[PDB]
Each structure stands twice: as structure tokens, then as C-alpha cells.
Design a protein around this ligand. Structure first.
Ligand SMILES: [Ca+2]
Ligand SMILES: [Ca+2]
Ligand SMILES: [Ca+2]
Ligand SMILES: [Ca+2]
Ligand SMILES: [Ca+2]
Ligand SMILES: [Ca+2]
Ligand SMILES: [Ca+2]
Ligand SMILES: [Ca+2]
Ligand SMILES: [Ca+2]
Ligand SMILES: [Ca+2]
Ligand SMILES: [Ca+2]
Ligand SMILES: [Ca+2]
Ligand SMILES: [Ca+2]
Ligand SMILES: [Ca+2]
Ligand SMILES: [Ca+2]
Ligand SMILES: [Ca+2]
Length: 335
């Protein structure tokens, strides 16, 4: 019943106020392991497992299942952990069973070309599907985001997101953004570990330092440079989150800035930038590097934070028109 009508992916015809893909009628926000799946809709309630992998579909996610394929051979001794193979046949004796030698998760996409080799639910990128989420559908300081298609955001808008469909535990995420205009000097970036419109990590880059023109609800000063922040809003999309996202630092009950480039180097107009992000939920590892061609423009260095155990990936925009995103790529890094 719940794991049938609750998920927006099973029935999109319902409300989902916090944009976490769980219908309002079922949403209770109880998530003890903070992996983005509430307790009663988590196949491993106490073990962090954001992608909810369950290869034998027995109700116990791989993360809390001792025999992920139910073939009687425990994971630790199974030479084909995700493919049933009782005889453990291994004709060349390399420790990998014949049953899964070319396609470990049996999603019909060989290991080498499979971006998520140990996840039957993901085999290729599908960033052809975006969920647009306005970060301030309350205030009207500026018009909300407008997206078109090269995914472009055309308005000097209020903050907003464009988030993908796939969910990840450990992941490497890369992409390209281009500001096709010399007008303005604000924000462009991306998100990862996205769970709800009140829960996600965000990486943003501003061109020139500037204080947000509306001192309400809180004073916000955004410095030029790359920043890494974690959002845990007590209010959700609105004016409070708005100013907090802009502020280079911490805003009570809204945002925490984990790192900011000490050099405050802003992005350049009409320049293609490539970002490379690595997130390892198990240890809380986070690192983002920005590139201008083959040149390194910014490097966050190792950052550690375990607020969120995983989630979706997406694009971020805040008061910057003509932001062109393209060539998005991602790969799972599990275990
Ligand atoms: Ca919801
Ligand atoms: Ca929720
Ligand atoms: Ca959970
Ligand atoms: Ca879990
Ligand atoms: Ca299972
Ligand atoms: Ca397991
Ligand atoms: Ca099992
Ligand atoms: Ca097994
Ligand atoms: Ca097996
Ligand atoms: Ca073998
Ligand atoms: Ca595969
Ligand atoms: Ca796969
Ligand atoms: Ca608005
Ligand atoms: Ca500019
Ligand atoms: Ca500006
Ligand atoms: Ca602006």
C-alpha cells in the first residue's frame, strides 16, 4: 500500500511539498539514518543506504542483507554477490564466478561500460529527466527560474534547482557550466546528496562579492569564489532559505558553509568550466575541483561532513541569467 501509492514515481498525481518524492499523505520526515528514505519506506531502516539497492528484492536492502542474491552463499564467500550461482563455478579461478564474469549486476550492460557496475538500477546516464524545484516560491524579490533547451536557465531569478532521477551512495559527479553573457556576477553551481528541498549539499560559485539587497529575513553577504555548503532548513523553500543560500557562512537553522575559496576567485564571463565532485558517504568525504579547460581554477581539498548519507544530483542557480549546463556525467563508487 505505502510502497505502492506513496512514491511519486509510482503515482505522480499527488502533492509533494518538500520535493522528496514521497507523497504528502505518507510523508513523516522520520529518517534516523539520514539517507533520505523515511523509516517506514527504507529497506534498511538503520543502515545508511541512499540508493536502496535490493538485488534479490526480498525487502532487505543489500546494505542490511547477508545474502544479496539469496543463493544460499553469504556475500563474504559468494564469488558473484549479486547473481545467483550456487555452484560458485569459476572456470579460470580468479575469484569471479562464471555466472557474473562480464556483468556483475546483470543489468545487461558489461562492467566496463556500466557506470554503476554493482547496481542493476543504473547502467547509463539519464540526465534527460529533470525535476525543477524553486527554492523560494514565497518571496518575489526576483522572478523564479526559467529553464529551456545544453540546459539553460534564462532569468536573473530567485534560487532554484534542476535535480536528476538517480539516487547515489558513493559517487563521482562531473559537469560543465557556461555563463553566456557578461551581465551580472552571481551564482551557478550544483547539488548532490539531495534528499528534499530542505536537505542537500550545494556547491556554488559567485563572480563578484555582493550583499543581498534584501536584509530581510537575515543579512547575507556573498563573496566571490567557490563555496561548499550543507542545507538543513527548518523552514524549507522560502525567503529564509533564500538569504541563507546567498550568505558565505552560516545562517541559523538554514545553511552551514563547509568551505569557501580563501582567494575569492570568481568565474569569468563566457568561459567553460568543468567541475569534478567526489562524495563518499561512509566517511563523509567531499571534494570539488573546478577546471577551466585543463587548468585547475579551484580545489576545495578534502572536506568531511556526514549530515547526509547520499541522495540525488542536480544543478543550482541563484540570480544569474543565461547559465548553460552541459555534458553531465556520473559514476557510482561503491563499495
Ligand atoms: Ca514529500
Ligand atoms: Ca519528507
Ligand atoms: Ca532512512
Ligand atoms: Ca537506510
Ligand atoms: Ca535483499
Ligand atoms: Ca549485503
Ligand atoms: Ca537476501
Ligand atoms: Ca549469495
Ligand atoms: Ca551469487
Ligand atoms: Ca572467473
Ligand atoms: Ca552491469
Ligand atoms: Ca549497473
Ligand atoms: Ca519567488
Ligand atoms: Ca559578469
Ligand atoms: Ca549580482
Ligand atoms: Ca542577479
Amino acid at each position: 500500500a505505502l510502497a505502492d501509492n506513496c512514491p511519486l514515481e509510482h503515482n505522480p498525481d499527488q502533492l509533494d511539498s518538500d520535493s522528496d518524492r514521497i507523497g504528502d499523505t505518507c510523508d513523516n520526515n522520520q529518517d534516523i539514518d539520514e539517507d533520505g528514505h523515511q523509516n517506514n519506506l527504507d529497506n534498511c531502516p538503520y543502515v545508511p543506504n541512499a540508493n536502496q539497492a535490493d538485488h534479490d528484492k526480498d525487502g532487505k536492502g543489500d546494505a542490511c542483507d547477508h545474502d544479496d542474491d539469496n543463493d544460499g552463499i553469504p556475500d563474504d564467500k559468494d564469488n558473484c554477490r549479486l547473481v545467483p550461482n550456487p555452484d560458485q563455478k569459476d572456470s579460470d579461478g580468479d575469484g569471479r564466478g562464471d555466472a557474473c564474469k562480464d556483468d556483475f549486476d546483470h543489468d545487461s550492460v558489461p562492467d566496463i561500460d556500466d557506470i554503476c557496475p554493482e547496481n542493476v538500477d543504473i547502467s547509463e546516464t539519464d540526465f534527460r529527466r529533470f525535476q525543477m524545484i524553486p527554492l523560494d516560491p514565497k518571496g518575489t524579490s526576483q522572478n523564479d527560474p526559467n529553464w529551456v533547451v545544453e540546459l539553460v536557465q534564462t532569468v536573473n531569478s530567485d534560487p532554484g534547482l534542476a535535480v536528476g532521477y538517480d539516487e547515489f551512495n558513493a559517487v563521482d559527479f562531473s559537469g560543465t557550466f557556461f555563463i553566456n553573457t557578461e551581465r551580472d556576477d552571481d551564482y551557478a553551481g550544483f547539488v548532490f546528496g539531495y534528499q528534499s528541498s530542505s536537505r542537500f549539499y550545494v556547491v556554488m560559485w559567485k563572480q563578484v562579492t555582493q550583499s543581498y539587497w534584501d536584509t530581510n529575513p537575515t543579512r547575507a553577504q556573498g563573496y566571490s569564489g567557490l563555496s561548499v555548503k550543507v542545507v538543513k532548513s527548518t523552514t524549507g523553500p522560502g525567503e529564509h532559505l533564500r538569504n541563507a543560500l546567498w550568505h558565505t557562512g552560516n545562517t541559523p537553522g538554514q545553511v552551514r558553509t563547509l568551505w569557501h575559496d580563501p582567494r575569492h576567485i570568481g568565474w569569468k564571463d563566457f568561459t567553460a568550466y568543468r567541475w569534478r565532485l567526489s562524495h563518499r558517504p561512509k566517511t563523509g568525504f567531499i571534494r570539488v575541483v573546478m577546471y577551466e579547460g585543463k587548468k585547475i581554477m579551484a580545489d576545495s581539498g578534502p572536506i568531511y561532513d556526514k549530515t547526509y548519507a547520499g541522495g540525488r544530483l542536480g544543478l543550482f542557480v541563484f540570480s544569474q541569467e543565461m547559465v548553460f549546463f552541459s555534458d553531465l556525467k556520473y559514476e557510482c563508487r561503491d563499495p
